[PDB]
GROMACS .gro file of C-alpha atoms in nm:
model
  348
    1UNK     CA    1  20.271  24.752   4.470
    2UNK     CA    2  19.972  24.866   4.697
    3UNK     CA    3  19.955  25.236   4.820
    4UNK     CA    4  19.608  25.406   4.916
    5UNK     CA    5  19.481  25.535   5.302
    6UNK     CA    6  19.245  25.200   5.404
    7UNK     CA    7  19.155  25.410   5.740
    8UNK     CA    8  19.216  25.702   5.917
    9UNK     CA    9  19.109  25.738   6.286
   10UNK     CA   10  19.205  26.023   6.585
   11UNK     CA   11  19.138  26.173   6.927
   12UNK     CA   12  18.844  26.368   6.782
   13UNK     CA   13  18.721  26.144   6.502
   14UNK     CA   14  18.354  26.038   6.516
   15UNK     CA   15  18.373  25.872   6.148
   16UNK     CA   16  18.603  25.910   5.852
   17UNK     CA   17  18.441  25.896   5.541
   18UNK     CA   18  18.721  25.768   5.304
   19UNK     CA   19  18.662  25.843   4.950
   20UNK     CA   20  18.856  25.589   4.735
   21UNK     CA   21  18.747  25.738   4.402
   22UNK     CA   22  18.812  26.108   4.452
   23UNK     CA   23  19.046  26.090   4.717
   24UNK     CA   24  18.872  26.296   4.959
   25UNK     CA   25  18.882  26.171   5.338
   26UNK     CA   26  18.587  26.369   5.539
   27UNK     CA   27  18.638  26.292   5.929
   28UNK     CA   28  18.376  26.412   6.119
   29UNK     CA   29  18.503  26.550   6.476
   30UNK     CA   30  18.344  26.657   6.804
   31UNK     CA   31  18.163  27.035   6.786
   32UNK     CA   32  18.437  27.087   7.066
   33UNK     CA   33  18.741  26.969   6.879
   34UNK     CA   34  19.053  27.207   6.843
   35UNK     CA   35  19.084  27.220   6.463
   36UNK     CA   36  19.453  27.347   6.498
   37UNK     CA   37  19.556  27.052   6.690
   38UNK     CA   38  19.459  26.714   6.543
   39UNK     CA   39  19.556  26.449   6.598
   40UNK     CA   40  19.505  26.177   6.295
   41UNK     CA   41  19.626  25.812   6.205
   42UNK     CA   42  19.621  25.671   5.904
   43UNK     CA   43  19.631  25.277   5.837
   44UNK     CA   44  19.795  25.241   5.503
   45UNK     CA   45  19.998  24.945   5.296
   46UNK     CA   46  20.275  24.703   5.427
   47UNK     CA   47  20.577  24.856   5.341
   48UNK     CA   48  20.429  25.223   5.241
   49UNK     CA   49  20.497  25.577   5.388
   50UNK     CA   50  20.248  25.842   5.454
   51UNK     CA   51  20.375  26.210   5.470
   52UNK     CA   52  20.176  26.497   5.472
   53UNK     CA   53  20.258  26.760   5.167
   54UNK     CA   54  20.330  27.090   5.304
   55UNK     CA   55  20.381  27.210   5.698
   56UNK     CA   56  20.192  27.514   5.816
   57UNK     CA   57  20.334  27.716   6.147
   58UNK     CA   58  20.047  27.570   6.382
   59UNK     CA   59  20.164  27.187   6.291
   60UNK     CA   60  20.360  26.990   6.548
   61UNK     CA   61  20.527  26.694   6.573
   62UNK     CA   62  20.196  26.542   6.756
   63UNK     CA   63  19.939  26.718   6.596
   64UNK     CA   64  19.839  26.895   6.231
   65UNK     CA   65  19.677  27.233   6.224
   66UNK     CA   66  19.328  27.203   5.992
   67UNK     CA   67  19.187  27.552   6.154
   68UNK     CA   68  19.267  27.758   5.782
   69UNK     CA   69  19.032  27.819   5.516
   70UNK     CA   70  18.900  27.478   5.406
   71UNK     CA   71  18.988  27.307   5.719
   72UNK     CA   72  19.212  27.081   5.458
   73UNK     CA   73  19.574  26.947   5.423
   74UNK     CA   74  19.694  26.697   5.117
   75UNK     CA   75  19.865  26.342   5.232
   76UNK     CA   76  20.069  26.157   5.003
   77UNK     CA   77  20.098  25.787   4.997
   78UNK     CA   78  20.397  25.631   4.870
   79UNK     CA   79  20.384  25.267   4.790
   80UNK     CA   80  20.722  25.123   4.913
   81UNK     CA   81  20.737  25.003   4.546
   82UNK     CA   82  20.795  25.405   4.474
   83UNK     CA   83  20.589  25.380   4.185
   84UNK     CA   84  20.283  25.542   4.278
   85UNK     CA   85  20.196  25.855   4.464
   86UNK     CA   86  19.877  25.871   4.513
   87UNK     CA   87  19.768  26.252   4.677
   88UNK     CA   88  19.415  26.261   4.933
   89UNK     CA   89  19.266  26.548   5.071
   90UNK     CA   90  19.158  26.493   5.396
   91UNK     CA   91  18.911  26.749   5.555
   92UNK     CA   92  18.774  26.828   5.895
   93UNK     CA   93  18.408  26.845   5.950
   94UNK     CA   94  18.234  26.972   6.268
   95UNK     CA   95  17.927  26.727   6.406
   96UNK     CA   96  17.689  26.608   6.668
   97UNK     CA   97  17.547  26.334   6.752
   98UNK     CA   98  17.231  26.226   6.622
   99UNK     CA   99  16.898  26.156   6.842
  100UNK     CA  100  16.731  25.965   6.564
  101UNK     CA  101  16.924  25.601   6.457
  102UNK     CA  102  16.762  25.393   6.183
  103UNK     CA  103  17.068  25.110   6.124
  104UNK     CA  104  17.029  25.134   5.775
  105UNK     CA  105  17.369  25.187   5.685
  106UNK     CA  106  17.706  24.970   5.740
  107UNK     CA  107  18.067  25.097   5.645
  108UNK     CA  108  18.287  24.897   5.431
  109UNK     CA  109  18.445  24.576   5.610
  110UNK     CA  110  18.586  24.234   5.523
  111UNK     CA  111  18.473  24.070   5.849
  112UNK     CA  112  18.166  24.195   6.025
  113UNK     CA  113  17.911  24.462   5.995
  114UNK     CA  114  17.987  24.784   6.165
  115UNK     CA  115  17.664  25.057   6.177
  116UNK     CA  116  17.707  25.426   6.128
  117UNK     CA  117  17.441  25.746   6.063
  118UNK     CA  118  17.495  26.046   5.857
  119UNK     CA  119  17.264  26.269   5.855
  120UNK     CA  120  17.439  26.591   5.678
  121UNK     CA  121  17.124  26.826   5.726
  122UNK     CA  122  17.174  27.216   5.559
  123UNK     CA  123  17.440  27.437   5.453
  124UNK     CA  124  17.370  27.645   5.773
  125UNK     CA  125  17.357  27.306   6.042
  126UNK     CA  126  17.564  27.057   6.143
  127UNK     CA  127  17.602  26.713   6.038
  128UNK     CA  128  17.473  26.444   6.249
  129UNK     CA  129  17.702  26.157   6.264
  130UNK     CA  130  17.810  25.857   6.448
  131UNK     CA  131  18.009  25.491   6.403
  132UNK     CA  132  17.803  25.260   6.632
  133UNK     CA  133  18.076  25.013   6.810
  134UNK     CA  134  18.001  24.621   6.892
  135UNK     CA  135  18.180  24.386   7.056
  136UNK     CA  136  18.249  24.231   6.690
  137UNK     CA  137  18.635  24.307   6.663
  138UNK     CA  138  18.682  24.087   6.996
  139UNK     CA  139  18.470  23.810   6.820
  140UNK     CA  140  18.671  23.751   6.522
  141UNK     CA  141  18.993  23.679   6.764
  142UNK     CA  142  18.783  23.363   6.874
  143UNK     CA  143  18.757  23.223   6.510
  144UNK     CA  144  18.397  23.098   6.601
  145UNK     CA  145  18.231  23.301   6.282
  146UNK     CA  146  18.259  23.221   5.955
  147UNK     CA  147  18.069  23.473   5.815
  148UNK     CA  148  17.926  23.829   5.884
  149UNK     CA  149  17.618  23.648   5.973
  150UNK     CA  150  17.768  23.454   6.272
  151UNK     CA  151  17.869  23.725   6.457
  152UNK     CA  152  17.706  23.885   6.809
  153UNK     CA  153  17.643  24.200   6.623
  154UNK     CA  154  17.463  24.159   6.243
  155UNK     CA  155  17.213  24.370   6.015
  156UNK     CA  156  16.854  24.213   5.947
  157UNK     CA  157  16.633  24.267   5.701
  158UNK     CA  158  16.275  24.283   5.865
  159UNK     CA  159  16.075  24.244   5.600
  160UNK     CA  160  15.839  24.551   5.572
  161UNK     CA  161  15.988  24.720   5.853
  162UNK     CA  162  16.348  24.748   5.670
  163UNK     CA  163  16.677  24.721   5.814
  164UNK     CA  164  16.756  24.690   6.161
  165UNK     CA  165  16.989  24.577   6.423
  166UNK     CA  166  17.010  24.166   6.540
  167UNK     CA  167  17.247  24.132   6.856
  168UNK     CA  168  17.260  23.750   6.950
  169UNK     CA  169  17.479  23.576   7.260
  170UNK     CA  170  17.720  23.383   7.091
  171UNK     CA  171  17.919  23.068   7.244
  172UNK     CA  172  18.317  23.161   7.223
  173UNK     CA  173  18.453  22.786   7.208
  174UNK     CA  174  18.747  22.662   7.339
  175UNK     CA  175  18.921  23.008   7.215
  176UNK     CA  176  18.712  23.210   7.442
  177UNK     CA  177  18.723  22.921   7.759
  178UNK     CA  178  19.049  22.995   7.753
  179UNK     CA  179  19.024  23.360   7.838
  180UNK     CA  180  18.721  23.278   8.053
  181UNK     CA  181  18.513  23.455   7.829
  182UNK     CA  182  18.275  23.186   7.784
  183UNK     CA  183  18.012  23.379   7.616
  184UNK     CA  184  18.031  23.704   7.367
  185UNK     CA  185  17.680  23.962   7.428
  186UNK     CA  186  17.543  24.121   7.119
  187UNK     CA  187  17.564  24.472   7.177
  188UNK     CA  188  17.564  24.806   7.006
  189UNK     CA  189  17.666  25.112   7.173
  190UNK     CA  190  17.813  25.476   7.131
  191UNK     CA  191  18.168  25.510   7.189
  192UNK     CA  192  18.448  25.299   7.136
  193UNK     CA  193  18.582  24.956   7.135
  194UNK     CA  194  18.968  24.923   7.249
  195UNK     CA  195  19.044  24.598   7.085
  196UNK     CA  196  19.403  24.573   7.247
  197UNK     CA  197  19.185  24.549   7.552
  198UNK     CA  198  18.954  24.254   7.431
  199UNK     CA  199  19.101  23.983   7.609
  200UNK     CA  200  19.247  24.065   7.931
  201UNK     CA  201  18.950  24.342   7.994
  202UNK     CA  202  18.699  24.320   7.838
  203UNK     CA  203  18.465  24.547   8.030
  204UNK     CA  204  18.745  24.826   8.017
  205UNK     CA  205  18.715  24.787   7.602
  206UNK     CA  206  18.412  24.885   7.620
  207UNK     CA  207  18.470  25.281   7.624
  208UNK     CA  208  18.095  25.456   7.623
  209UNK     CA  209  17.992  25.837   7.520
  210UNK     CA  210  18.056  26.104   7.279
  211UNK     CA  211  17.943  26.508   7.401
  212UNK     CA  212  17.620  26.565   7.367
  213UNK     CA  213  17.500  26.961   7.429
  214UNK     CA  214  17.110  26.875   7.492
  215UNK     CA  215  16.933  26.735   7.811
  216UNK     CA  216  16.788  26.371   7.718
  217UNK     CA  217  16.449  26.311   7.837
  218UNK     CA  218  16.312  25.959   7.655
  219UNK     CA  219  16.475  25.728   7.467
  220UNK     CA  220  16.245  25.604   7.237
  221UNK     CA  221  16.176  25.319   6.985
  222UNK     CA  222  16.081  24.903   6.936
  223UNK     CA  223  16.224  24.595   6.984
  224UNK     CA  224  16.176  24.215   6.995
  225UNK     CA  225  16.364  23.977   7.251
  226UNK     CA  226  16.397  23.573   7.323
  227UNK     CA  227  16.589  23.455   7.575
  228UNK     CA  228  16.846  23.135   7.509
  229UNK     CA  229  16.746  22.791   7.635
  230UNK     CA  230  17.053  22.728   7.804
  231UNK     CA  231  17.136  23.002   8.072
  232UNK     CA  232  17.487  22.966   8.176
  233UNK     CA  233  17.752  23.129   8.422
  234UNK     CA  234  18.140  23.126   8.357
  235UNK     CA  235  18.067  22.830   8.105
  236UNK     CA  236  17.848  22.619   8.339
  237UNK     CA  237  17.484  22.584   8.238
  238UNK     CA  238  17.265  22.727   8.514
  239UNK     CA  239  16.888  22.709   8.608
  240UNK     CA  240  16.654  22.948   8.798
  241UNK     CA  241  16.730  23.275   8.588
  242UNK     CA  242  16.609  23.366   8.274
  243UNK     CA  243  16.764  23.548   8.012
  244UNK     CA  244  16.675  23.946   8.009
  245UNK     CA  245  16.795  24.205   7.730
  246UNK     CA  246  16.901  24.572   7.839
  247UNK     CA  247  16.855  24.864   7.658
  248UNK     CA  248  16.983  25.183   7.836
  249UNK     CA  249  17.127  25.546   7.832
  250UNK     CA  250  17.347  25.759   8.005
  251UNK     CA  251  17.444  26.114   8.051
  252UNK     CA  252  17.773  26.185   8.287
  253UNK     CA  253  18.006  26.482   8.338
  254UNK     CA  254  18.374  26.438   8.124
  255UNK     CA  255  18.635  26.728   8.288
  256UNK     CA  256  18.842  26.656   7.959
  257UNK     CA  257  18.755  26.490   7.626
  258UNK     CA  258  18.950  26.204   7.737
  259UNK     CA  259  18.710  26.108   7.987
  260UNK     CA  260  18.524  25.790   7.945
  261UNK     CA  261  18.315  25.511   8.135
  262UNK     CA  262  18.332  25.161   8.079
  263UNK     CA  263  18.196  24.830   8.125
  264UNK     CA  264  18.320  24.853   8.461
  265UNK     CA  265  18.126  25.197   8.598
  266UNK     CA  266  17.902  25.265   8.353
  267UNK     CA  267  17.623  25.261   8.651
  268UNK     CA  268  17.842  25.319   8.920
  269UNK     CA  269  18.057  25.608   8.834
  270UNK     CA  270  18.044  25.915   9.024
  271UNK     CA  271  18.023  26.121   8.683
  272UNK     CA  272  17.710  25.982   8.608
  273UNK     CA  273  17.419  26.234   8.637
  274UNK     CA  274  17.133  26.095   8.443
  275UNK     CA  275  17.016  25.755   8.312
  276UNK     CA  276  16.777  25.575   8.111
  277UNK     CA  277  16.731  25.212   8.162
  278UNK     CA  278  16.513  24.968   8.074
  279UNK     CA  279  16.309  24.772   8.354
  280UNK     CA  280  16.350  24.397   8.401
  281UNK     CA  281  16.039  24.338   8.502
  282UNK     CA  282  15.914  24.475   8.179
  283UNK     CA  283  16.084  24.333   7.954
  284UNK     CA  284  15.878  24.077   7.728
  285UNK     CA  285  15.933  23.774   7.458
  286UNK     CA  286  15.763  23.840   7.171
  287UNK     CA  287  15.751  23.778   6.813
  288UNK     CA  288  15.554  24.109   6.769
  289UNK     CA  289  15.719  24.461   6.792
  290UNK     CA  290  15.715  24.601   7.119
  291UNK     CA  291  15.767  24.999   7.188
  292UNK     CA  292  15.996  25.107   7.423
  293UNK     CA  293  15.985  25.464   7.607
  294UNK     CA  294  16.247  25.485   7.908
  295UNK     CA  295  16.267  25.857   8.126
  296UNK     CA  296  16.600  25.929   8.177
  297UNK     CA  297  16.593  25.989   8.527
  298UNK     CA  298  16.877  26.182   8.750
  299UNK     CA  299  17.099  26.001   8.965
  300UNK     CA  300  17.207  26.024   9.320
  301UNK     CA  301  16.990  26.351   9.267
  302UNK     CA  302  17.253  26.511   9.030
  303UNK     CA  303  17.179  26.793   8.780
  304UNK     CA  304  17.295  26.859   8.415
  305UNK     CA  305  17.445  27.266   8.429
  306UNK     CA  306  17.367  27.474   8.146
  307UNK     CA  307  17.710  27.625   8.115
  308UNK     CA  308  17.876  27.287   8.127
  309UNK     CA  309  17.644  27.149   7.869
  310UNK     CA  310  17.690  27.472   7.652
  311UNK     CA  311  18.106  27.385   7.692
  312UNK     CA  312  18.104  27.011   7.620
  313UNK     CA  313  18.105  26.868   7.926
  314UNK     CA  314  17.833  26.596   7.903
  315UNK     CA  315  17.849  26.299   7.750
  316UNK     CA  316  17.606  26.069   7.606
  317UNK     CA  317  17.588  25.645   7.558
  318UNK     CA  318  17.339  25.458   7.428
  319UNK     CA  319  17.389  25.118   7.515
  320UNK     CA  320  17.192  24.782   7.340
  321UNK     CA  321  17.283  24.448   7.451
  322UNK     CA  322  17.142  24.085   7.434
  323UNK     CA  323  17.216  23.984   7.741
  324UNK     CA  324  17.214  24.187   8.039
  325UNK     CA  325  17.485  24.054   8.275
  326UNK     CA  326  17.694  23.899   7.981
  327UNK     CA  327  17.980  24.134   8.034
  328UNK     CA  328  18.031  23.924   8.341
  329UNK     CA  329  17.985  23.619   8.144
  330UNK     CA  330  17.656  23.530   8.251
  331UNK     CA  331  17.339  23.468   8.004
  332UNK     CA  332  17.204  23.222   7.767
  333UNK     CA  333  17.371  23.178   7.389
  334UNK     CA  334  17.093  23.225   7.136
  335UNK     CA  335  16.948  23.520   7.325
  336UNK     CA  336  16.851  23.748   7.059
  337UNK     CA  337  16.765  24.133   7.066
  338UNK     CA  338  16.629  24.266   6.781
  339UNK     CA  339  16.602  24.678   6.719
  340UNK     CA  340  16.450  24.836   6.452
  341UNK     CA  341  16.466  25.182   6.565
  342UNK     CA  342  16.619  25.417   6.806
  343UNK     CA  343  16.516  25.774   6.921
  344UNK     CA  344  16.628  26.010   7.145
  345UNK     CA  345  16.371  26.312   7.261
  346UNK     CA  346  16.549  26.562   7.443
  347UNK     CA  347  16.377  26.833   7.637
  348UNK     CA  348  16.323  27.242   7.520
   0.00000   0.00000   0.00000
């Protein structure tokens, strides 16, 4: 019966933009990415085959060459059922990151909402692009939500602002006690979430950065927070600390493309050159919009090197969350971050 691509994901791939009607996959890749080795998956129908229609002299058993002409190559889709052989195009696509975010826009899901920009610019720049991750996949496992709505990660409407970005502390239930992940953070951040990962490390799912070729200087833009009632650690309530969103940014050196941080180093790692984090002690509750303007400032007295930056070798997260310290499992449920608005201003 069924036959059709539902996603298509890779080492390079930023966002795939599948079209169901004309068949056309676009997957936006890193400005750095080798567009004669790609590597792609596809997540298709129970039962189906996917098998690419012709083989060109640069594919390999690993990876398909897209570096001709239209930076194109047809996939067909048997159903299982052999009845229908649906053909797509996918196509490459060169793009950056962008340095403005609005959260206006949510890709197709079934379960929870999952942000993304496009900003496809001119026929002589690049397109701006980016699928914002959340800890969202890891909350469905704990069966807590029964809706898009109940998750740590949601749209808003604002009213007269428009759209923007709730992130909420959720409780996990018994589910998530026993994991000893008594509370899921709202967050929002660049890079990637590693599902298989979102039980027995959850701070290593959280994979931050994409390359970024320009040197950060503010992030930029306005938010509302309220702490929880109930602060709690590991599952136990807890008095004498109050709730505190964090809102930060960070620029470290990647060797390779594989290189990532995590939940675990992300302000610790030796790779780390700059950062941008908001202060506790400014933080405030408010049901009015507050701006926010952080410096990214170096660290450990490190410097970003043209040439390296030119080549790819910087990467950049931005990082939203809730509830500071509730990686660790610490912070109130019902702390609630609201963003409206994200910018980056980058120096030159």
């Amino acid at each position: 019966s069924e036959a059709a691509i539902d996603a298509c994901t890779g080492d390079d791939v930023q966002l795939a933009n599948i079209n169901a009607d004309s068949k056309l996959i676009n997957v936006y890749v890193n400005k750095g990415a080798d567009l004669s080795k790609q590597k792609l998956e596809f997540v298709i129908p129970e039962g189906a085959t996917i098998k690419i229609n012709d083989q060109v002299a640069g594919d390999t058993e690993a990876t398909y060459d897209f570096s001709e002409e239209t930076h194109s190559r047809k996939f067909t889709v048997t159903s299982e059922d052999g009845q229908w052989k649906p053909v797509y195009t996918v196509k490459v696509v060169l793009a950056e990151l962008p340095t403005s975010f609005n959260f206006e826009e949510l890709l197709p899901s079934n379960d929870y909402d999952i942000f993304y920009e496009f900003q496809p610019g001119t026929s002589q720049e690049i397109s701006k692009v980016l699928q914002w991750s959340s800890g969202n996949p890891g909350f469905k496992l704990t069966g807590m939500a029964n809706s898009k709505t109940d998750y740590p990660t949601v749209q808003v409407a604002n009213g007269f602002r428009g759209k923007g970005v709730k992130l909420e502390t959720r409780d996990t239930g018994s589910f998530g006690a026993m994991v000893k992940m008594y509370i899921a953070a709202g967050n929002l951040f660049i890079g990637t979430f590693e599902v298989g990962n979102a039980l027995t490390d959850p701070r290593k799912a959280t994979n931050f950065g994409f390359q970024f070729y320009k040197r950060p200087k503010t992030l930029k833009g306005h938010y509302k927070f309220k702490a929880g009632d109930v602060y709690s650690v590991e599952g136990k309530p807890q008095e004498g600390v109050r709730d505190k969103c964090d809102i930060y940014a960070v620029m470290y050196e990647a060797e390779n493309n594989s290189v990532m941080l995590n939940g675990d180093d992300v302000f610790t790692s030796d790779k780390l050159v700059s950062l941008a984090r908001i202060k506790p002690e400014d933080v405030v509750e408010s049901d009015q919009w507050t701006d926010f303007e952080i410096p990214f400032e170096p660290v450990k007295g490190r410097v970003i090197d043209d040439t390296k930056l030119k080549n790819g070798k910087y990467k950049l997260g931005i990082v939203l969350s809730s509830s500071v310290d509730g990686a660790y499992f610490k912070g109130a449920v019902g702390s609630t971050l609201y963003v409206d608005e994200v910018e980056l201003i980058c120096e030159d």
